[PDB]
């Protein structure tokens, strides 16, 4: 039955709008400056950064880091609320609900971060900002390579033309994974994933019939995510060695057990 999967697909688009205030659509309207309804403040060097706050309400490299760490937590809270709305997620072994979040969360961040990105920068601060890719690359040595990996992935990723209804199910799929180290009841997690996967596959053919082997292409990107996360996890640690100036958030370092 296919009309069962269209229920699950439209259901996860309701949760997605309810759990994530800035969608890809709202972000496209902003990034497509042809919709110059209310443009954002471009931050392209250290001088336009200091002018950022005064206007778009908020060392530079540390200050930008602590910024993306403020949104990181506001994403896990939205992800986590979205995690709860995936059928059967609340009924799972609550010890594995933590394992699902711990390993799956950054992968959703980078997925949805690609929405706010294009070749040149990233929508920041509810879409009121737009920090430049080059400015970020031209940061201090340990940070000149913090966002660039994500910008390279997002360019490959956004070429799939996924929309919010698409992304929703793909988001659920990533969350529900058996691969995660330390899962207890691996069996009931895989049961629901196959539902989402089936739901994903059908949603993709309906909304993108004129691109065959798209459901194919998307899943290869699910493993590309784990490389971003890993490499980012380990580069976040060598900075913890040289930068005792930093105080990383509780929630983030609660999940930042590497490997």
């Amino acid at each position: 039955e296919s009309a069962d999967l269209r229920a699950l697909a439209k259901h996860l688009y309701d949760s997605y709008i309810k759990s994530f205030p800035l969608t890809k659509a709202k972000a496209r309207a902003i990034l497509t400056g042809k919709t110059t309804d209310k443009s954002p403040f471009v931050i392209y060097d250290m001088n336009s950064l200091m002018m950022g706050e005064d206007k778009i309400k908020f060392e530079v490299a540390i200050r930008i880091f602590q910024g993306c760490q403020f949104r990181s937590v506001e994403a896990v809270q939205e992800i986590t609320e979205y995690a709860k709305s995936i059928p059967g997620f609340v009924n799972l072994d609550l010890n594995d609900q933590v394992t699902l979040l711990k390993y799956g969360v950054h992968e959703i961040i980078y997925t949805m971060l690609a929405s706010l990105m294009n070749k040149d920068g990233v929508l920041i601060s509810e879409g009121q900002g737009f920090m430049t890719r080059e400015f970020l690359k031209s940061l201090r040595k340990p940070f000149g390579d913090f966002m660039e990996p994500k910008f390279e992935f997002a360019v490959k990723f956004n070429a799939l033309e996924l929309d919010d209804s698409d992304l929703a199910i793909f988001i659920a799929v990533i969350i529900l994974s058996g691969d995660r180290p330390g899962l207890l009841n691996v069996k009931p997690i895989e049961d629901i994933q196959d539902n989402l996967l089936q739901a994903l596959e059908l949603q993709l053919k309906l909304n993108h019939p004129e691109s065959s082997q798209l459901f194919a292409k998307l899943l290869q990107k699910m493993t590309d995510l784990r490389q971003i996360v890993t490499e980012h996890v380990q580069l976040l640690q060598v900075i913890k060695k040289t930068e005792t100036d930093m105080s990383l958030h509780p929630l983030l370092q609660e999940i930042y057990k590497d490997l």
């Binding site: 709860k84 609550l94 609900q97 933590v98 509780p250 609660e254």
Partner: peptide, 12 residues
């Protein structure tokens, strides 16, 4: 080890 902050994001 069991991460306390997340469990309070699930209950609520």
């Amino acid at each position: 080890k069991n991460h306390p902050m997340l469990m309070n994001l699930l209950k609520d």
